[PDB]
Design a protein around this ligand. Sequence first.
Ligand code: FES
Ligand code: FES
Ligand code: FES
Ligand SMILES: [Fe+2]
Ligand SMILES: [Fe+2]
Ligand SMILES: [Mg+2]
Ligand SMILES: [Mg+2]
Ligand SMILES: [Mg+2]
Lengths: 383, 383, 383
Amino acid sequence: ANVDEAILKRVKGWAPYVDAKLGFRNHWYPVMFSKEINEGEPKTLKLLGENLLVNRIDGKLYCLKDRCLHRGVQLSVKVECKTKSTITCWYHAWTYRWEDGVLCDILTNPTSAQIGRQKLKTYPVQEAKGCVFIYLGDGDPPPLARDTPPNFLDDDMEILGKNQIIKSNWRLAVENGFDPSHIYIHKDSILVKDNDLALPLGFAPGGDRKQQTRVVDDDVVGRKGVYDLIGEHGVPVFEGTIGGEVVREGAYGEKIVANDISIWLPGVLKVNPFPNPDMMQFEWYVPIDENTHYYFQTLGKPCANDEERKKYEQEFESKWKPMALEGFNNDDIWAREAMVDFYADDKGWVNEILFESDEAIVAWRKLASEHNQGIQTQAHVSG
Amino acid sequence: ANVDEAILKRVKGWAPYVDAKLGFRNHWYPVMFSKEINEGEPKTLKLLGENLLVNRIDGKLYCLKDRCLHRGVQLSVKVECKTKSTITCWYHAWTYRWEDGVLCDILTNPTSAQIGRQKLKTYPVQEAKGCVFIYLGDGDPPPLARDTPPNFLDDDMEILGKNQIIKSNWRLAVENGFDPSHIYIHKDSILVKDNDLALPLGFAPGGDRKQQTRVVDDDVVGRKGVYDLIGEHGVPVFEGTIGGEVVREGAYGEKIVANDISIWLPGVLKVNPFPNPDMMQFEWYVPIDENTHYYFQTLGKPCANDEERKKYEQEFESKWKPMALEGFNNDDIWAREAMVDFYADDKGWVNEILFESDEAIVAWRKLASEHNQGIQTQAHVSG
Amino acid sequence: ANVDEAILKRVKGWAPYVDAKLGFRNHWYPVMFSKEINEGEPKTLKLLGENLLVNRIDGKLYCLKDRCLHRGVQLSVKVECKTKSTITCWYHAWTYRWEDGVLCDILTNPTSAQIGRQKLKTYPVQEAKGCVFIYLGDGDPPPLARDTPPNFLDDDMEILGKNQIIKSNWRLAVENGFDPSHIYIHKDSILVKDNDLALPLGFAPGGDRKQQTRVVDDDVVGRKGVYDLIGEHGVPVFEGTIGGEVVREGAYGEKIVANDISIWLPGVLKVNPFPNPDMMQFEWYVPIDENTHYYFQTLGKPCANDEERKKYEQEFESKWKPMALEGFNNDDIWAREAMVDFYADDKGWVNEILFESDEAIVAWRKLASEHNQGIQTQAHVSG
Ligand code: FES
Ligand code: FES
Ligand code: FES
Ligand SMILES: [Fe+2]
Ligand SMILES: [Fe+2]
Ligand SMILES: [Mg+2]
Ligand SMILES: [Mg+2]
Ligand SMILES: [Mg+2]
């Protein structure tokens, strides 16, 4: 539906992933932090290509599509919230209920036969760990835990993070994240120097294809994921050679990080431990449109009480955010960007030449192709 | 000719209107004010997608296509008017007469077989009421009166105005203007409060469908238009309600305006009286290209003589222009622009959900569809 | 392929020229000066739509395609030359030899089965007269002399120049440079006044529509060009008339220049003498992409020794560069740009109306259609 048929035909093993340029419908996605949306101060955003309005009413979050049923304007051009439970289009005053999207009045014509017979699309929203998730799908949603990685929701896990808009397709972000050889780009990171990380240049793989990863398509709550096992079973490269001469070495630090690396639908990576042996990183690459994503980064640490939490917050602002979320992951941002040209006409999916460590990426494309809950298309966007 | 055939088959009530992205060929259009073009100072503009040159020679206006027949450059890049009656292309000196577009000379080759055998396209041009109108069409033009609203050309009507370029398709602008319910957006206007206008929020429509409008396809000079009669049979709504609670109002005003409202081919709105009970407003939404229009605003006041026009003038400059043309209509500008995205891909014409006050708009779309003098296409722009 | 068949069928005699929007493959093109490319300091450029990396290694120049075989990134986003004879991709460290493009190592996986089984595209590169030429084609190159105008390579000919990126398609630049009547645009040039050039407004042909050009098919080096003879055989126009009245005069002058004017594949103009009797101008219009070219300008002067070269360089910097290359050719820059719109949708190639002096341009279009060594396409830009 999104990609030229010629191209889709020529990718067989994961064609629906190739098609999912706008992301996967019927999943939850984080879009902002809870502290970024205040009582009665609606925020606008784009997700899976659809513009959305999110408001907080009596502490609770609601989501309406930011497109009036009448002439298709964004309501957010001029927000008119005249009662606590409704929003009034600025143009001809069609008035919708935030709770169910029902067109419940029209100030310019109280007699209209439309009133009570139309419904603006709404989306479920839920807050968890200080993060706003929108279920960008139809019908009653599954629990949040299905579309989060293991441990993200643990009672004791304190989540902090950072969000920004990145100009690449979401899949280029996912694949960069889950790619075992990409760690080559991080070899000069200030995190690696200053936090004394052990970091190989990459890994020589051992065993055949199926041993490189482990698919998790079971799971209690229905999570679908892939664990990368390359560097559990492979030989780390610490001395990179060209024609037999050592030209570059890996980082010989003392802290062991990234023992477990996994990727989960709808597109969230878990790195454990990281950036320190006590923490986890959970980052989402959230489809905004064809060319754009939210890079929704979080760092988790278990905390039993409240002064732990206060200690963690101060470590986050002074150390983990600048050193790791920026100083390590910035190189990820421009690596994603650098893949844009080759994949932008959709021909990179056919012309790429993969090698052995891309086994993890192929597993991901397969898992996503068969376990996503729907392919967002242009018909979902303009409909 | 301009829109996907699948879309045209779904808007059968008014398909040629939806097709008319560039506007309607074979009508007169105002493009500037007479006083903005001085003797021997050609001006450049784009109309219906076509770049044009207008010049004032011995006080008479002339219009040539601003595209040399030879290599297709705009002559306006470097104007060379070497005699009063001619223009010489800056590139190889092909020289045209303003009066008939004939290639009368070539300075670079005075023996060319082309000389006297080629003709650059010219368009009729006429000045009335201090406005420059160009007949963007072929053959013998009609009287200007066919393509202007009633009273505009009355002998004592003094016209004053303002022109600017707005980034929406001309149809967005026409429909916004003729929309009986859009006046919602004007509820906080400075004009409404400072000139004691009795402006409702909308109208509960009364009587039957056929009574909401009155098509004029029966004017003796050949005018084609639609009167909006929603305020004749309908009830004005001055109190805005949601759930039976008053949330908004029309407030304090004694002056009745805009009881006479009509839209006329090729796309000009008449509102009478407005902005005061002794004036009327005529405004055009002139297609520049697919994405742009001139918003050619005029105010008409009947004036007996030279002194009465001077008093109209002072008052236009100090009160009516800042308060009404700018103050009141600025909201119209941002409303048009807010419909751009919905209609950009031609999908809005199928996906809109109209209500009762949009009878006026539908009547216009049918009128435009039936009585236009041709659809401008890209083949007219290029060839 | 690059152009619609409904246009190509309408330009019989020169359709391969109209199709060659990206230029002609399998020719040498100049892209920069020798001094701009130093030992061990790779430079990036785009040629025939392809991103290329050039490097200097032990004085010798090499050219690799700037696109990794793995995931299609430009290597030049972060250049990593880890040994003299190789470049290592910054992403997963696939490592290529400059000399043959072979994938000789991967730092991230020294056991990959890709090593020694993939080859990145290379192109021959050669330096002549201080200018770097890349053979943008396949297989073994021809001699450089085939794709350079007569006398550019003469032993005594000292070459100085200037290069810049211009936003027009390359063909518009070529046609402007070889166009006999375009000299009309140069009529007010300071060069013309200050160096007392004889410069007519144009030339009325001397007789038949078949003695205006001389096609050079022969030439033992294999060069393919057209000489413009109108200047030698026509009647110069020094008094331009409209309605029989003189409106403009040409520039009288002592110095006769541009006796010998020729255009050569792949798109290089030779003007002799110019801008003074003992000098020549050779300029290339080198396709970068569909909308852009390098304007690669050179002036040749025979210099017997170092004192003559030194004298020439001072005169170049103080006068010829500012007065001729900048002052005089600046009007050719905007003349090219002014043709963009008409030819942008490919319709100008059908809608243009040619006159007698365009016989030169037509002879060039047919020559180029005949003797080009292949049309560059998007598929070559990809694969
Ligand atoms: S566009 Fe929202 S009420 Fe008309
Ligand atoms: S383009 Fe106008 S005379 Fe050649
Ligand atoms: S993209 Fe160059 S090595 Fe992976
Ligand atoms: Fe990374
Ligand atoms: Fe309005
Ligand atoms: Mg709800
Ligand atoms: Mg005329
Ligand atoms: Mg002179």
